[PDB]
Design a protein around this ligand. Sequence first.
Ligand SMILES: CCCCCCCCCCC(=O)OC[C@H](COP(=O)(O)OC[C@H](O)COP(=O)(O)OC[C@@H](COC(=O)CC)OC(=O)CCC)OC(=O)CCC
Ligand SMILES: CCCCCCCCCCC(=O)OC[C@H](COP(=O)(O)OC[C@H](O)COP(=O)(O)OC[C@@H](COC(=O)CC)OC(=O)CCC)OC(=O)CCC
Ligand SMILES: CCCCCCCCCCCCCCCCCC(=O)OC[C@H](COP(=O)(O)OCCN)OC(=O)CCCCCCCCCCCCC
Ligand SMILES: CCCCCCCCCCCCCCCCCC(=O)OC[C@H](COP(=O)(O)OCCN)OC(=O)CCCCCCCCCCCCC
Ligand code: HEM
Ligand code: HEM
Ligand code: HEM
Ligand code: HEM
Ligand code: HEM
Ligand SMILES: CCCCCCCCCCCCCCC(=O)O[C@H](COC(=O)CCCCCCCCCCCC)COP(=O)(O)O
Ligand SMILES: CCCCCCCCCCCCCCCCCC(=O)O[C@H](COC(=O)CCCCCC)COP(=O)(O)OCCN
Ligand SMILES: CCCCCCCCCCCCCC(=O)O[C@H](COC(=O)CCCCCCCCCCC)COP(=O)(O)O
Ligand SMILES: C/C=C(C)/C=C/C=C/[C@H](OC)[C@@H](C)[C@@H](OC)[C@@H](C)CCc1oc2c(O)c(OC)cc(OC)c2c(=O)c1C
Ligand SMILES: C/C=C(C)/C=C/C=C/[C@H](OC)[C@@H](C)[C@@H](OC)[C@@H](C)CCc1oc2c(O)c(OC)cc(OC)c2c(=O)c1C
Ligand SMILES: OC[C@H]1O[C@@](CO)(O[C@H]2O[C@H](CO)[C@@H](O)[C@H](O)[C@H]2O)[C@@H](O)[C@@H]1O
Lengths: 62, 93, 246, 125, 385, 385, 55
Amino acid sequence: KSTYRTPNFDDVLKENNDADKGRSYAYFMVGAMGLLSSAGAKSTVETFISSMTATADVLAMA
Amino acid sequence: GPPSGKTYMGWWGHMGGPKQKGITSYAVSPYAQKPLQGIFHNAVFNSFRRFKSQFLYVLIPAGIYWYWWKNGNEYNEFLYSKAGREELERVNV
Amino acid sequence: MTAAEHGLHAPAYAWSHNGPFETFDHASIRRGYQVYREVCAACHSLDRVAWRTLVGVSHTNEEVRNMAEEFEYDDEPDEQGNPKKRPGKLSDYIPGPYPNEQAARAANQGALPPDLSLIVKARHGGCDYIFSLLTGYPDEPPAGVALPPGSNYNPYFPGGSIAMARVLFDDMVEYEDGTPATTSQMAKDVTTFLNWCAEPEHDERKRLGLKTVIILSSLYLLSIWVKKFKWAGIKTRKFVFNPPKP
Amino acid sequence: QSFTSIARIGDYILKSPVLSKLCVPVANQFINLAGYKKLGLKFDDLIAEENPIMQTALRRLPEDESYARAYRIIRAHQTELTHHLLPRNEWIKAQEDVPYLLPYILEAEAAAKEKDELDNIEVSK
Amino acid sequence: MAFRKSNVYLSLVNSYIIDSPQPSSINYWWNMGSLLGLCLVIQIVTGIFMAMHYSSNIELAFSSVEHIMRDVHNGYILRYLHANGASFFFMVMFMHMAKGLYYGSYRSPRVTLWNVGVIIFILTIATAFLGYCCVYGQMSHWGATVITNLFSAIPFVGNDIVSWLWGGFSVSNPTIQRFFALHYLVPFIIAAMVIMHLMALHIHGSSNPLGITGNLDRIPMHSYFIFKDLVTVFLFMLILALFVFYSPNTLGHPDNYIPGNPLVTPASIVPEWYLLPFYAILRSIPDKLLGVITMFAAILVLLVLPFTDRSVVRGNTFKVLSKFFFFIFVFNFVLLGQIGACHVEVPYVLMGQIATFIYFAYFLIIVPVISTIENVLFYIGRVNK
Amino acid sequence: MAFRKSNVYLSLVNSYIIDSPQPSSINYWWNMGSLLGLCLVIQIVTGIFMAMHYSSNIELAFSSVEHIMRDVHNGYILRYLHANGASFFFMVMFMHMAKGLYYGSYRSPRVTLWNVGVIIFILTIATAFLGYCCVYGQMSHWGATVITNLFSAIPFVGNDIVSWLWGGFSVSNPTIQRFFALHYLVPFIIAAMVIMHLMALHIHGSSNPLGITGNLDRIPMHSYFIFKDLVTVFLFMLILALFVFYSPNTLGHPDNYIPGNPLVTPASIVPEWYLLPFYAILRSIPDKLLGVITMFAAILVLLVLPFTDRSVVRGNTFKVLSKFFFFIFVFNFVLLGQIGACHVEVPYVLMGQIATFIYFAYFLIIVPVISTIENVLFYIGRVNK
Amino acid sequence: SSLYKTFFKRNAVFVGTIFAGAFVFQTVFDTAITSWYENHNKGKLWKDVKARIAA
Ligand SMILES: CCCCCCCCCCC(=O)OC[C@H](COP(=O)(O)OC[C@H](O)COP(=O)(O)OC[C@@H](COC(=O)CC)OC(=O)CCC)OC(=O)CCC
Ligand SMILES: CCCCCCCCCCC(=O)OC[C@H](COP(=O)(O)OC[C@H](O)COP(=O)(O)OC[C@@H](COC(=O)CC)OC(=O)CCC)OC(=O)CCC
Ligand SMILES: CCCCCCCCCCCCCCCCCC(=O)OC[C@H](COP(=O)(O)OCCN)OC(=O)CCCCCCCCCCCCC
Ligand SMILES: CCCCCCCCCCCCCCCCCC(=O)OC[C@H](COP(=O)(O)OCCN)OC(=O)CCCCCCCCCCCCC
Ligand code: HEM
Ligand code: HEM
Ligand code: HEM
Ligand code: HEM
Ligand code: HEM
Ligand SMILES: CCCCCCCCCCCCCCC(=O)O[C@H](COC(=O)CCCCCCCCCCCC)COP(=O)(O)O
Ligand SMILES: CCCCCCCCCCCCCCCCCC(=O)O[C@H](COC(=O)CCCCCC)COP(=O)(O)OCCN
Ligand SMILES: CCCCCCCCCCCCCC(=O)O[C@H](COC(=O)CCCCCCCCCCC)COP(=O)(O)O
Ligand SMILES: C/C=C(C)/C=C/C=C/[C@H](OC)[C@@H](C)[C@@H](OC)[C@@H](C)CCc1oc2c(O)c(OC)cc(OC)c2c(=O)c1C
Ligand SMILES: C/C=C(C)/C=C/C=C/[C@H](OC)[C@@H](C)[C@@H](OC)[C@@H](C)CCc1oc2c(O)c(OC)cc(OC)c2c(=O)c1C
Ligand SMILES: OC[C@H]1O[C@@](CO)(O[C@H]2O[C@H](CO)[C@@H](O)[C@H](O)[C@H]2O)[C@@H](O)[C@@H]1O
């Protein structure tokens, strides 16, 4: 078999209808994963930091 | 830097494998492939492949142990019921 | 282990707080406090519960303030060094009935009524067990069972022999909201109140759980899609061998 | 376990009509159930190589077979990573599942054994 | 060259997490290691933040955990994360170890990797023990009591070691305070041990599901595996979240919600689930000394596997008999755990004794016998004479 | 290859402690590093053992240290070693840093080495501060108050950070307990930084008193420097033992033998001796914010040395003007410390302000001017054109 | 998808936007969840019971 004859990738390739179909999907997916990871990270950092603030039992305004 | 020992793995450019000749490989950019739909086309279709090929190696020992457990569990239940106090006095002390 | 020793399994009642999306019924919490105060408090403490925690949950600031002010607490000694008392405040903890373990056992034939602040989490069965115990005292023990002088039979209690006698009887309390105070209704109410004592974070815990699980579920599916994309080139990589010429 | 030892026991069984009629069928069954042929590998491709005997053997293996081994290995990792099997027409057939490395392994093992014996010989004056 | 390769610090990050050559075919079972790293970090971070509101004094210990549950903002999240986190830490370590058993990861040249791992397992169990004691509930007191007494089985100096560990006449104030001190220490030793684990892993790289060389087709750690690990990181978090917020106490024991009492051992006493199999092993030997020895040997026997496996190939992928017995072993391990959760009663006692023998026989008999048989089977199933 | 070089773990020990090529001419000043390692180990070990008898509760802290002092066998030795050990740690660190300024150890290619060092210095100071707070004497309380309040200078979020560090209205229970938790944590962070420190040292090796290349004549770390370091180790232990057994409280403050009182700052309040120079710098500025900034800049300006040293040769060995001004710097630092122990009074206030100026002028003005001048002196003093 | 292109045009979303989006998401998501949660539990919350208890 000649190395110049590229094997069949038809079942994997998409018809050139929108070359950016995959890109946009991939970028939205990455973008959303990063958005939610950032929200999650901020919430986690805040959860720990806030646990160091005055506990419920020492806020007595006697 | 000091000389450390030889191992069976190296690094990029001298990994430690045999010389490779005659193999040609091809690949296509993920950006040029159908926006991932193989999650419910060749994953759910080809699903249970890893199942029906290996399940017996897991199911038989699983079944053997489950039966042994249920059998011993029921025997215990009987031994501690009114109907089993006679056999309980025997097998115990 | 014999059935008696095990104790009867407690059935699953439909607590309105059973379920990932359910808060406690606060009206039931409020009613439960009354049952605790009028029926249980005389023998059982609630040492880890501070008055201020009832506020915004089952009573208003005023209602709790007034409830607390009915009890005395050790104050700071006067200028001369003599001890002095003071009315309780929101920062104080619900006062117990006994000064020490000895006084408690004396008022209960040698037995010690445990603190109930964690009773719901300190027993297998949770609410179902507490409820079943409170409403599970038969009029007489089963035939053949000899009961230790001073004991009471309850199938749900391991061994069957418990130092606490049945205390819940129809209409021994008069609910403020006009609810018929039947034994089971009162049992349902205190158990709910006791669950709050043990898990005051319940409502808030579940709310954050919904948030956390939706974010992570999304994050999980997202990560799979992203992974498949970054691996697409490798997953479809093709190989061909052409035996080299010697 | 050394291949010399495996061969000694295996040859013994293979020469005995009684044992051979009893064991070989079970062994054939075992190899088909093993499934490595469905991945396109020959048994000798499965031998753990991180030891001096195998390194010696793989060094001595002729160029052409060495390139062939490399292909079967690479093709297998790829197939395995995709969670598929190769099409049947690419499966190694029983006729092809030949012990190509074995002779090199036995040779290397015998040399090391002799070297070990000679390193520890006693002398009788 | 790139700054990530030339910089003294970044080059370490680069070699272990970025350019590290991974076998192209390692499956999801190879994601357990990164997960154990997450666990350690989760455990340490949550522990430190809780440590800020905890009191080791035997009289304030239990209430200070209650103080974290009730008064500390997000305190119940910290505690449930820590407590449930410990459980997940063990479930993941069990899978990581099982992955090792199944794929012959313990085999040469990865013996040191395996041995350091056995070290980590022991430190992790000791750490978990010490942490549980700090709560000072009924299970804590009696667990501290039973486990410290394990050393009383050492002849002659046995009882002195126990008095030394206790720092008194029984588990008391000095015992809880040092246990908390030690609980804080060991996680840092484990981390040190993890680094050694990774150093051994690095000189040989990871193995693969085929059990053969990965040298012919490696793909960089960065991107492929950094993102593949993220998948399991999120699934681990999702499941831990399900337990933490929706079922935070199903993996624990209600008795630990009752303050420790030196005069009463609850009839309902049961060790933490992850310790149950070892507990069952010890309980199977009707002799004090022989009982502790066998239980400890149950962990140490993991060290003999590199020598009892006679197979000429690494891993169980192509071995029918080995695959079958591997699952017998796994299921025997679960049964040992279930036995541990039962009472010392007739059917269960014999079953435990039988399961205990099956546990040791796997490493000492079944593995070496079956592997030898498979070597011959692969040979006679093809070679002609 | 020798097993010490081939083994994955021993090869690290061998390259850092055995075969490491050391410049043949390094003198005893290069023995401070190993001494600092000894200090860290002394602090960690003595600390862990005391932690076993300590109670961070504000109501129990002071008494728990007294319990260690009276009731714990050899407990006074632990505390006196830990306490005096802290001071020695700082005296040896000051000499280690001074050694650096003198021999130009901060310059290329060792700036990363120096910067990590500055990081370690800060971490150690914070650790020592947290430790002092755990005794909860009169100095502990007020030290905690002043130092946490240092952050109230940050605009807008200032008072919020303080409230967060305190965990309440003032230095109280939540503060002492978290400070103990963090006191236990930072020393492990320092250990990790020390590894980064040693990593950066290793790729370039040590410098020498001649300030020139050591590549033409290296001698192995083992025997030579292993035994030379032993000399200073014993000396260090001898002097430290003298204080621990014969003068345990000379380096301390009597006021810290008095339980913390939230309503009374003693008129005799003085910071721990090793912090005095920095304290004097802060007092020299009649403005709150500028005071804390200048004090922090006093530590950060150490990072500027690699750029302000314009000299073409490394070290002061052959530099008359630099050698002189270096000692002006050392004694000025000592004086700043003396001013620190004095009351805010007339002669002292001006002296502190001028000394503070000299401290900064050294790095920003003196070094660059003097080094430039010497560059030209070395040139015209021989070049005949 | 043109919906994506109109906003980012073949470029991946930048950090700043990601972070900015995370801040908007926290507020909006919290409100939506609390809202759904409280409504699902109408009649059980203290604020609902406080309204009932008027005598
Ligand atoms: C109580 C405490 C528990 C804490 C532990 C939580 C983490 C669990 C880890 C699970 C694990 O290690 O299982 C590994 C096995 C091996 O699997 P394999 O041969 O490598 O995979 C081939 C993939 O489909 C390739 O496929 P893929 O393209 O990479 O996507 C795979 C799949 C991965 O899903 C996961 O999250 C992995 C478990 O994504 C999906 O399609 C799922 C959509 C809902 O995966 C299985 O077979 C799972 C059954 C055991
Ligand atoms: C302070 C509280 C905490 C600190 C406690 C630890 C103290 C250690 C720090 C001191 C230090 O680093 O001093 C370094 C200087 C520089 O010295 P050098 O130029 O390199 O030495 C040439 C050697 O004599 C060669 O000679 P040698 O053959 O190595 O023996 C040297 C000498 C070493 O003594 C020591 O203990 C080292 C300080 O032993 C003796 O003969 C005298 C015994 C008293 O040593 C000095 O002589 C100081 C000069 C001012
Ligand atoms: C001190 C010693 C401790 C050690 C004890 C062991 C730990 C306890 C066990 C916990 C779970 C571990 C399960 C086994 C570990 C994973 C096994 C594995 O690696 O399986 C790989 C296998 C199929 O993979 P293959 O690569 O071989 O497929 C061939 C492709 N050509 O995949 C399969 O066959 C499918 C996997 C089936 C898993 C079912 C596990 C059942 C576990 C019970 C759960 C416990 C809860 C009570
Ligand atoms: C944040 C800021 C950090 C910096 C703070 C600095 C604080 C000061 C540190 C305290 C001790 C000072 C250590 C002195 C610094 C190193 C001294 C040194 O290296 O001196 C070398 C010098 C001669 O050495 P040569 O290598 O140049 O000899 C070449 C022969 N051809 O040999 C000499 O000069 C003789 C030795 C001089 C002894 C030092 C005396 C000063 C002692 C201070 C007393 C402490 C008071 C409590
Ligand atoms: C409705 C109000 C009450 C509630 C909710 C309640 C609840 C409980 C519960 C849950 C237990 C734990 C049993 C166990 O170990 O599982 C208990 C024990 C006990 N209670 Fe009560 N109780 C109430 C009223 C009383 C009264 C009025 C008294 C005192 C006369 C009393 C005396 C005791 C005693 C002595 C025990 C010990 C049981 C034993 O160990 O045998 N209780 N109670
Ligand atoms: C804190 C616990 C541990 C950590 C962080 C850890 C981490 C890791 C990591 C990151 C890997 C590489 C990826 C993988 O295969 O998952 C690995 C591999 C390995 N670990 Fe661990 N490990 C731990 C405990 C253990 C234990 C207890 C054992 C054994 C008793 C063990 C045995 C192994 C082996 C044998 C490998 C190589 C697997 C292979 O490549 O086939 N590890 N570990
Ligand atoms: C490998 C890491 C760790 C493991 C496996 C571990 C495990 C445990 C376990 C099993 C418990 C009892 C859980 C319960 O039922 O409540 C516990 C408690 C505790 N741990 Fe850890 N721990 C780890 C690290 C840490 C660290 C580094 C600290 C100290 C800074 C810490 C501080 C505590 C505290 C304060 C408690 C008491 C509060 C509680 O009950 O959760 N832990 N730990
Ligand atoms: C716990 C803290 C520290 C430890 C354990 C440590 C340890 C060491 C060691 C073992 C050496 C080699 C031998 C020697 O020169 O004494 C060294 C060199 C060095 N260290 Fe440190 N160090 C510490 C802190 C610092 C600090 C605070 C600085 C500077 C602000 C620093 C600056 C240096 C420099 C510049 C060198 C190279 C000196 C030369 O070769 O000329 N170190 N250190
Ligand atoms: C490695 C650097 C360390 C330094 C510089 C250091 C420094 C200090 C200082 C200045 C004090 C006050 C001494 C006094 O006047 O009484 C102190 C106290 C204390 N430190 Fe550390 N420490 C270190 C590490 C540790 C570690 C790892 C622990 C472990 C928990 C620890 C535990 C304690 C305890 C319990 C006290 C209070 C008892 C006492 O006064 O000695 N320290 N530390
Ligand atoms: C102790 C071990 C704990 C965790 C082990 C897990 C290992 C994975 C770490 C993930 C880092 C991802 C960085 C990707 C990167 O830099 O590539 C950057 C791209 O990064 C992105 O697109 C950001 C996507 C959002 C990342 C999600 C954060 C993960 C949540 C953290 C949870 C972990 C505790 C290079 O991109 P480019 O190659 O296309 O030019
Ligand atoms: C924060 C950590 C900083 C960095 C950590 C690395 C520092 C290393 C300091 C440790 C010095 C102790 C090394 C002793 C190990 C030497 C022997 C050895 O490695 O034998 C190993 C086996 O070791 C084990 O089974 C146990 C590991 C010991 C765990 C120690 C806690 C043999 O390995 P070998 O090098 O001989 O491999 C080739 C032979 N086919
Ligand atoms: C240090 C790692 C600890 C994280 C362990 C994760 C296990 C699941 C429980 C997480 C809950 C903690 C906070 C919480 O309750 O938030 C909840 C939201 O949680 C999430 O979104 C969790 C997803 C996790 C993403 C984490 C990214 C990685 C961490 C980076 C840290 C720099 C509630 O949020 P909230 O307080 O309402 O603002
Ligand atoms: C200062 C540090 C010290 C003393 C460290 C000691 C470490 C010991 C071992 O770790 C290496 C040990 C934890 C490990 O044994 C190998 C476990 C499997 C022990 C398993 C174990 O648990 C129990 C438990 O949890 C209980 O709870 C209420 C009660 C128990 O009996 C009633 C047991 C028990 O009978 C056993 C065998
Ligand atoms: C959770 C951890 C936290 C909040 C850590 C904070 C760390 C801050 C800094 O470390 C980097 C800080 C310790 C360091 O500043 C650079 C020192 C030189 C501060 C010097 C210092 O000491 C004093 C002291 O010791 C006292 O004792 C009785 C009393 C003091 O006034 C009366 C002072 C004082 O006026 C100053 C400036
Ligand atoms: O404390 C109650 C008291 O009642 C006795 C009377 O003989 O027991 C009978 O009555 C109890 C209350 O109705 C039952 O709980 C008990 O089961 C029944 O036998 C005493 O035994 C007991 O001390």
